[PDB]
Design a protein around this ligand. Structure first.
Ligand SMILES: CC(/C=C/C(=O)NO)=C\[C@@H](C)C(=O)c1ccc(N(C)C)cc1
Ligand SMILES: [Cl-]
Ligand SMILES: [K+]
Ligand SMILES: [K+]
Ligand SMILES: [N+]
Ligand SMILES: [N+]
Ligand SMILES: [N+]
Ligand SMILES: [N+]
Ligand SMILES: [N+]
Ligand SMILES: [N+]
Ligand SMILES: [Zn+2]
Length: 356
């Protein structure tokens, strides 16, 4: 069916920071986005998909039993033990509701992937929190508990075939270190991340995010890092990266399902990202991805902290999924962006004939 799915559940707002109510990963991130969908009359055009809890067996598709156990144990912790547990990780806060919210974010995306793969919808958007792409097999990180996108790729394979070709495009301004590591030896899941890097000065502060990390073993060539250096980037740079790298590689890979780790923290106005991608920019990125996998695209909220920016940007993506005409948007690239793109082209030409 030529239908767009949408999943949102206000229960995911319950995850909160009890020590700093102004922490940027706010409950109202998802309610503001949902409201904007209603205001723009997008919500009524979508098929509503229910949220559900991920099961612990589903979480074990990507995470260790110990990590699942540790996060589950936070459900009945007193505040000082929540503080202690959170502090074991890089950039994590935890409340008694966090585990359930993380389960809902994952289960929402499983139901969305299922709706796509059973033909109930063509494509879908998932307005979920907390985010997922920094979460590793064995640890939480960067506001993320479980790796929602990675889990969704494995869940998709679990109801089709182990080798189902899944493309994950991660346009959150941060590197999805967890997603890269979970799939680093896998050729069934192509991971492509665009991210601010600044030679390691930008979170998560690891050389794992550099362009020369191309995958391991049979996964060699199936990890594509597009790192930005030298300050502000925007629509011109992202469009060029899609033109020269993301789309030619994706077409050669021929995915059967596309997942977008769709953070909107590279957006104009975001205080954590410092970049300038416009809502129209995100619309064009979405419209390009819709040409892949017979349109089977699932857009999953990751980061993004300017409430107005993320609401306008993710709504524009949903508008594209619904088949609306792309808005009007060539400006020369920042010189360092040309350097980045050419570095990635050089790194991946051995693996992808489309780059030669
Ligand atoms: C962890 C993270 C992004 C995650 C993300 O979006 N991953 O995809 C960003 C850190 C480095 C950051 O910049 C920050 C800034 C302000 C702040 N407070 C004002 C509390 C807390 C953290
Ligand atoms: Cl418990
Ligand atoms: K990214
Ligand atoms: K991979
Ligand atoms: N509407
Ligand atoms: N539930
Ligand atoms: N306590
Ligand atoms: N890796
Ligand atoms: N393709
Ligand atoms: N280039
Ligand atoms: Zn981010």
């Amino acid at each position: 069916s030529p239908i767009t799915g949408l999943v949102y559940d206000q229960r995911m707002m319950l995850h909160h920071n009890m020590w700093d109510s102004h922490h940027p990963e706010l409950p109202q991130r998802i309610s503001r986005i949902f409201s904007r969908h209603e205001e723009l009359r997008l919500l009524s055009r979508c098929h509503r998909i229910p949220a559900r809890l991920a099961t612990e067996e589903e979480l074990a598709l990507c995470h260790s039993s110990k990590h699942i156990s540790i996060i589950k144990s936070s459900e009945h912790m007193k505040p000082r033990d929540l503080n202690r547990l959170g502090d074991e990780y890089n950039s994590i806060f935890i409340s008694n509701e966090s585990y359930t919210c993380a389960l809902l974010a994952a289960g929402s995306c499983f139901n969305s992937a299922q709706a796509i793969l059973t033909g109930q919808v063509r494509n879908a958007v998932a307005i979920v929190r907390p985010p997922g792409h920094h979460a590793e097999k064995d640890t939480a990180c960067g506001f993320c508990f479980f790796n929602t996108a990675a889990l969704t790729a494995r869940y998709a394979q679990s109801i089709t075939r182990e080798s189902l070709r899944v493309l994950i495009v991660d346009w959150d301004v941060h590197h999805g270190n967890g997603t890269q590591h979970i799939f680093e030896e896998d050729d069934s899941v192509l991971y492509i991340s665009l991210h601010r890097y600044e030679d390691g000065a930008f979170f998560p502060n690891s050389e794992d995010a550099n362009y020369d990390k191309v995958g391991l073993g049979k996964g060699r060539g199936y990890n594509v890092n597009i790192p930005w250096n030298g300050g502000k980037m925007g629509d011109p740079e992202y469009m060029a990266a899609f033109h020269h790298l993301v789309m030619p590689i994706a077409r050669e890979f021929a995915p059967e399902l596309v997942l977008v780790s769709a953070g909107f923290d590279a957006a104009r106005g975001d205080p954590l990202g410092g970049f300038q991608v416009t809502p129209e920019g995100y619309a064009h990125l979405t419209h390009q991805l819709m040409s892949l996998a017979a349109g089977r695209v699932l857009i999953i909220l990751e980061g993004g902290y300017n409430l107005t920016s993320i609401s306008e940007s993710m709504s524009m993506c949903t508008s594209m999924l619904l088949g609306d005409s792309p808005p009007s948007l060539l400006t020369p690239l920042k010189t360092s962006a040309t350097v980045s793109i050419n570095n990635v082209l050089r790194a991946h030409a051995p693996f992808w004939s489309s780059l030669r």
